[PDB]
Amino acid sequence: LEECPYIPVRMVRIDGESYGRSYVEEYLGDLKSLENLQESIVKMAMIT
Amino acid sequence: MNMQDAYFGSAAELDAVNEMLAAIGESPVTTLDEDGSADVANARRILNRINRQIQSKGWAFNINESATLTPDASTGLIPFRPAYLSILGGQYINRGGWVYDKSTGTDTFSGPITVTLITLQDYDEMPECFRQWIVTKASRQFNSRFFGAEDVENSLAQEEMEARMACNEYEMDFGQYNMLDGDAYVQGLIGR
Amino acid sequence: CFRQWIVTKASRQFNSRFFGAEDVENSLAQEEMEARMACNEYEMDFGQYNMLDGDAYVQGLIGR
Known part of the structure; x- marks a missing residue:
């Protein structure tokens, strides 16, 4: 058990789950919101 | 048209004519068919x-964004009936009395086509706010064309503006x- | 909408050329303007x- 070459490493581990959750998921919502605002700002400049 | 009772389709339209007559100070009529004249007919x-x-x-209530037009069975021609007040949502232009396509230079259609349609609907089956606006606007237009008074038109202009607002609020309340x-x-x- | 503008504009002209009343011309001037707006909205709704x-x-x- 202690020495196995195949070591599955995960970050943000939740009990009862076979896999970990990424760190970006905790802030994906802000990334989506910023994506839309930044897109529209660039769109306005092209109209300009 | 009133399928529940054909009386309501004629009683309501009688009142509309009977209300535009009062806009120029005329005594009400009782039977529309039996009173021809040259003033009721103009009304x-x-x-x-x-x-x-x-x-x-x-x-918001007379626009049907999902209206379909079946293009015959053997031929593919859709008649452009005069009941179609405005056919928008595409490129149909009423080429030769039939429905054209503009984008595609064709007149025959293989199957039914969906389009936003406005169909001419009877006066008696309009919202009450729109019924009031139709009568008030018509009576104002009926004054200027034939009577053409001055203080009557000033009063009717205010009533039409007041009645138009009521429809605008209902249009907003209906669609929210x-x-x-x-x-x-x-x-x-x-x-x- | 375009048919209403054509008739209203023509009747307004037909007044001035032949009948030439005053209150009729003022009333038809407002009617022609209102009909022109309705055609303009249809132009934008059609073209998008x-x-x-x-x-x-x-x-x-x-x-x-």
Whole structure:
């Protein structure tokens, strides 16, 4: 058990789950919101 | 048209004509068919024109965005009946009395086509706010064309403006439009 | 909508050329203006013009 070459490493581990959750998921919502605002700002400049 | 009772389709239209007569100070009539004259007949003609003019503007209740037109069975021609006040949502232009396509230079259609349609609907089956606006606008137009008074037109202009606002509020109440969750583009941006 | 504008504009002209009343011309002047707006809205509703995706030059700039 202690020495196995195949070591599955995960970050943000939740009990009862076979896999970990990424760190970006905790802030994906802000990334989506910023994506839309930044897109529209660039769109306005092209109209300009 | 009133399928429940044909009386309501004629009683309501009698009152509309009987109300435009009072706009110029005329005694009410009792039977529309048995009272020909040259003043009732003029009144009905203006009421008919005003009715489809207001309907053709496009409102939340008389616009059907999912209306379909079946293009015959053997041929593919859709007759452009005069009941179609405005056929928009595409490129159909009424080429030769039939429905054209503009984008595709064709007149025959293989199957039914969906399009946003406004169909001429009877006066008696309009919302009450729109019924008041149609009569008030028609009576104002019926004054200027034939009577052409001065203080009568000033009073009727205020009434038409007041009646138009009531329809505008109902149009908003009917649709209850939203700029956050009813908006076709912000809804995607709100998603998080 | 275009038919109503044609009739209203023609009747307003037909007054001035031949009958030439005063209160009739004032009333028809407002009617012609109102009918012209209705045709203008139908022009935009039919065309659905866009300044970002329907525009001939900005659409190229949108590409990324």
